[PDB]
Design a protein around this ligand. Structure first.
Ligand SMILES: Nc1ncnc2c1ncn2[C@@H]1O[C@H](COP(=O)(O)OP(=O)(O)O)[C@@H](O)[C@H]1O
Ligand SMILES: Nc1ncnc2c1ncn2[C@@H]1O[C@H](COP(=O)(O)OP(=O)(O)O)[C@@H](O)[C@H]1O
Ligand SMILES: [Mg+2]
Ligand SMILES: [Mg+2]
Lengths: 294, 268, 275, 65
């Protein structure tokens, strides 16, 4: 593994290229108290998660070499992200491209959720596109298993822009819905090329959500008040769905509405979403080799 | 480099005695413009980009964590004097720090408090700044404009932390933080707070009512209470300033501010 | 899930012959390394197995009185890590005490059981100097354990399958008046299966079913009808043979001998002091 | 090239487990702990716990190394 280029840096670790071409994510030590912990918990979590997972639309972990100080992971070279595609104004996103991206994301999440695992960090730059246009989920640092009523994790996991109202209202226990809403947000971004609800504060995020989709009632959320961080809101009428996305068809409107129910139990899942009439409708989703490339 | 003292999201500091912080233009310009005895003194600039600072032995939060007895009032008053001098120097230089917390405060063996972490400082804005445990209600309720009151609140909260060695409003969440502030101080009103209805949060949300001035049960002299209420004035235009706080009668009481030199030693 | 997992693909073996040959290979490898470095001080593989069993019991005792309370999944994962590590390594190279401590630490980290290092060592019956020394050794050997596990850090335990089988018996078996009375005894039997190496030979669902059926047979309740109809000829025979092998392994297991473990511990200390 | 959904199939090497939508019909959820309204608000139901328990009970039951 001959390091040859620098690919960026984040809060979890530092990533750089290497000769097949791969990418090493080397983990830096945490805080002073976290330096005594040893191997970083995010890295161990991601190691086990990608060791127990195998799917064409999930990033592939190859090697996890390291030394005493910390650990370093190795992944396949991922050409670009989805955020690059979205933010690039030179790239025209035909409805087929949106259909293909949503199809890949939904299939990956279907496989992930079948094994009782929540990504909890869904957002466009986390969806990586290869040289063959194969979208793969990544950044499994926050990915945690779900189903057992024993372990409850922090609600403050997803970023503020793509956080479901169940998480924003401080829910200890949740299910697949926390992913699905994020997916919908991504879908909305693919329809507008700008963040759907780009709130700065989390309360402002809630205001944006309720101003765009209308304030939920007890009919659409039977136990909304039961949440501990539940805050009362004024009844916004909510913009009709066809006004926000004028170019989206009726099936796409139904898919978006299903992805954007306020009740997490009634919110559609990956299998249900793949079974909607939108994906089988004309035109067919674009192949991997015909997706836009920067 | 000798050892990494601590890790940060946008900058990591090593010990070398000096401190080498690896990270931009905003922070370096703000730190350069505010050279002062009570402000972190940058020695030079080297190149990733690195900033060299005069090494301090400890910070306030680490000292509080690893010490059992409470603060003696004299050193509390001395630290408040130094903090007020520093924030007034920042205010005179038209600098808003918005990152005042016990972690940022650095205390040396000589009893000198020397603020730093100018990543969130700006020239006077950005809607969401300041940590949740010290953020002012105006920025909590989505006020697009703010002033020195945001640093004044942080100073008041730091004073409250000094008094009891525990955060005043350690809100679990933003809604929880607002609820904690309202419960401990009393919910604001239009009569108390002019321009209340204009706040974006109130226009689109409803809160609960609480009795006024419930913070006294948590704790301080009567002049200490007056100065504390001066910190916890709801109205941003009515909240006291550092210059007037220095002129307050609480700084002249029976436990007079002890000099920085007479400071009990702690492990390094 | 187990049906496509690293544990099934790599860490489940045909029979005890593979386990014995792997342990003998590890012992021979360490002997060759020592003789190349520069004879009666090396312990035989059976003595290594005895010491491994004794220190597995010690790890069980450690996790029993751990504070905060260790979920059964965490201790199960720790035991599986211990067995996996000492299947391909020698007690004469890495000490069992520090290895079991680092196994418990890694199980706490993997199973999302957030406990700080001082908290993790506050349960150690050692001096504060002993506790911090144990901390340094654990930090040193955590990566070694990680590497020796082939980075397969997810371990499936039979407790969840046991709960699932109990639920299924409750709903779809009206013949059994109350499956609950068959839990506790089965739990005890499960503990026995922990002591033996059955974790490396049979999947957790079979282990849980074997424990439940052994508990049923001990109480005299016969439920072959559950397997025949509710669970719906080769498959039934294979399941029955697997249960028979489980019971044979449980019977055949022998607890350690105090004088034997004392002598083996002295010999092990001699080997570790020498090299 | 159109698309038509194919339910992905992986062998569990064990007895068939009922589909998620219909556990409560046979009284499976009767013998589990009822989900509190706080969990129901966030989208958590006892159906998930029961289905996970049953899926892990019947997984790999018929496998031979
Ligand atoms: N498999 C990969 N192949 C190529 N580049 C990658 C791969 N994974 C991550 N990267 C790059 O490394 C960077 C990682 O930073 P990121 O994960 O965004 O930090 P954070 O998670 O703290 O925001 C990204 O900018 C991305 O472009
Ligand atoms: N000169 C110094 N003296 C003492 N401690 C310092 C000094 N410089 C930095 N530190 C330590 O480093 C930490 C600040 O890290 P910082 O650079 O603010 O990271 P970030 O900017 O990414 O948040 C503080 O907790 C402080 O204890
Ligand atoms: Mg990423
Ligand atoms: Mg800082």
């Amino acid at each position: 593994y001959e390091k040859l280029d620098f690919l960026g840096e984040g809060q979890f670790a530092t990533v750089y290229k290497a000769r097949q071409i791969v990418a090493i994510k080397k983990i830096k030590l945490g805080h002073r108290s976290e330096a005594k912990d040893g191997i970083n918990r995010t890295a161990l979590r991601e190691i086990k998660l990608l060791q127990e997972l195998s799917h064409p639309n999930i990033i592939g972990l190859l090697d996890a070499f390291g030394h005493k100080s910390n650990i370093s992971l190795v992944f396949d070279f991922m050409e670009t992200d989805l955020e690059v595609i979205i933010k690039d104004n030179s790239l025209v996103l035909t409805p087929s491209h949106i259909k293909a991206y949503m199809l890949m994301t939904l299939q990956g999440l279907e496989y992930l959720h079948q094994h009782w695992i929540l990504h909890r960090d869904l957002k466009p730059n986390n969806l990586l596109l290869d040289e063959n246009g194969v979208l793969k989920l990544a950044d499994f640092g926050l990915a945690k298993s779900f189903g057992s009523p024993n372990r409850a994790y922090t609600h403050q996991v997803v970023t503020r822009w793509y956080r479901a109202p169940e998480l924003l209202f401080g829910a200890r226990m949740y299910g697949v819905g926390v992913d699905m809403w994020a997916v919908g947000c991504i879908l909305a971004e693919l329809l507008l090329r700008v963040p759907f609800l780009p709130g700065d504060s989390d309360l402002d995020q809630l205001t944006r959500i309720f101003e765009t989709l209308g304030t939920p009632t007890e009919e659409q959320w039977p136990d909304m008040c039961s949440l501990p961080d539940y805050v009362t809101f004024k009844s916004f009428p909510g913009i009709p769905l066809h006004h926000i996305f004028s170019a989206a068809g009726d099936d796409l409107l139904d898919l978006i509405q299903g992805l954007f129910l306020f009740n997490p139990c009634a919110r559609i899942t990956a299998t249900q979403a793949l079974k909607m009439k939108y994906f089988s409708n004309r035109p067919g989703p674009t192949p991997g080799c015909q997706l836009p490339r920067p | 480099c000798l050892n990494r003292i601590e890790e940060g999201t946008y900058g990591v500091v090593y010990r070398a005695i000096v401190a080498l912080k690896r990270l931009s233009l905003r922070e370096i310009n703000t730190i350069l413009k505010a050279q002062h005895p009570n402000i972190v003194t940058v020695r030079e600039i080297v190149v990733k980009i690195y900033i060299v600072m005069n090494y301090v032995e400890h910070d306030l939060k680490s000292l509080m964590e690893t010490m059992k007895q409470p603060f003696l009032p004299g050193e509390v008053k001395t630290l408040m004097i130094q903090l007020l001098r520093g924030v007034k120097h920042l205010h005179d230089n038209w600098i808003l720090h918005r990152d005042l917390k016990t972690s940022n405060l650095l205390l040396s063996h000589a009893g000198i408090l020397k603020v730093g972490d100018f990543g969130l400082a700006r020239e006077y804005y950005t809607p969401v700044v300041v940590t949740l445990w010290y953020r002012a209600p105006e920025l909590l309720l989505g006020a697009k404009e703010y002033s020195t009151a945001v640093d004044m609140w942080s100073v008041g909260c730091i004073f409250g932390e000094l008094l009891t060695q525990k955060p005043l409003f350690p809100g679990k969440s933003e809604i929880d933080q607002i609820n904690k502030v309202f419960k401990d101080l009393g919910t604001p009103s239009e009569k108390i707070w002019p321009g209340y209805s204009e706040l974006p949060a109130v226009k689109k949300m409803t809160f609960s009512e609480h009795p006024y001035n419930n913070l006294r049960k948590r704790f301080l002299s009567d002049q200490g209470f007056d100065l504390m209420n001066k910190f916890l004035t709801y109205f941003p235009g009515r909240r006291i300033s550092a210059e007037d706080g220095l002129k307050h009668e609480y700084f002249r009481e029976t436990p007079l501010p002890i000099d920085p030199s007479m400071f009990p030693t702690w492990p390094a | 899930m187990y049906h496509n997992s690293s544990q099934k693909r790599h860490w489940t073996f045909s029979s005890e012959e593979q386990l014995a040959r792997l342990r003998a290979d590890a012992n021979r490898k360490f002997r060759c390394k020592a003789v190349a470095n520069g004879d009666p001080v090396f312990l035989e593989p059976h003595e290594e197995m005895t010491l491994c069993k004794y220190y597995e019991k010690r790890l069980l005792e450690f996790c029993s009185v751990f504070k905060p309370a260790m979920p059964r999944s965490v201790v199960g994962t720790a035991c599986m890590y211990f067995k996996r590590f000492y299947l391909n390594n020698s007690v004469m190279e890495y000490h069992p005490r520090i290895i079991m401590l680092t196994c418990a630490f890694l199980a706490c980290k993997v199973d999302e059981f957030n406990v700080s290092s001082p908290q993790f060592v506050g349960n150690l019956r050692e001096s504060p100097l002993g506790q911090e020394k144990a901390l340094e050794q654990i930090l040193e050997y955590e990566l070694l354990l990680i590497q020796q596990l082939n980075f397969h850090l997810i371990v499936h335990n039979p407790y969840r399958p046991f709960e699932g089988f109990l639920i299924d018996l409750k709903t779809r078996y009206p013949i059994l008046e109350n499956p609950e009375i068959l839990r506790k005894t089965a739990d005890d039997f499960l503990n026995r299966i922990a002591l033996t190496d059955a974790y490396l030979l049979y999947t957790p669902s079979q282990i849980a079913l074997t424990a439940i059926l052994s508990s049923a047979s001990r109480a005299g309740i016969t439920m072959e009808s559950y397997l025949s109809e509710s669970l719906m000829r080769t498959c039934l025979s294979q399941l029955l043979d697997i249960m028979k092998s489980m019971r044979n392994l449980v019977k055949k297991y022998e607890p350690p001998r105090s004088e034997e473990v004392a002598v083996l511990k002295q010999k092990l200390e001699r080997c570790h002091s020498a090299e | 090239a159109l698309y038509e959904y194919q339910p992905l199939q992986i062998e569990t090497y064990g007895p068939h487990v009922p589909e998620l939508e219909m556990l409560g019909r046979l009284g499976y959820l009767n013998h589990v702990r009822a989900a509190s309204p706080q969990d129901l608000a966030g989208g958590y139901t006892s159906s998930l716990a029961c289905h996970r328990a049953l899926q892990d009970a019947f997984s790999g039951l018929f496998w031979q190394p």
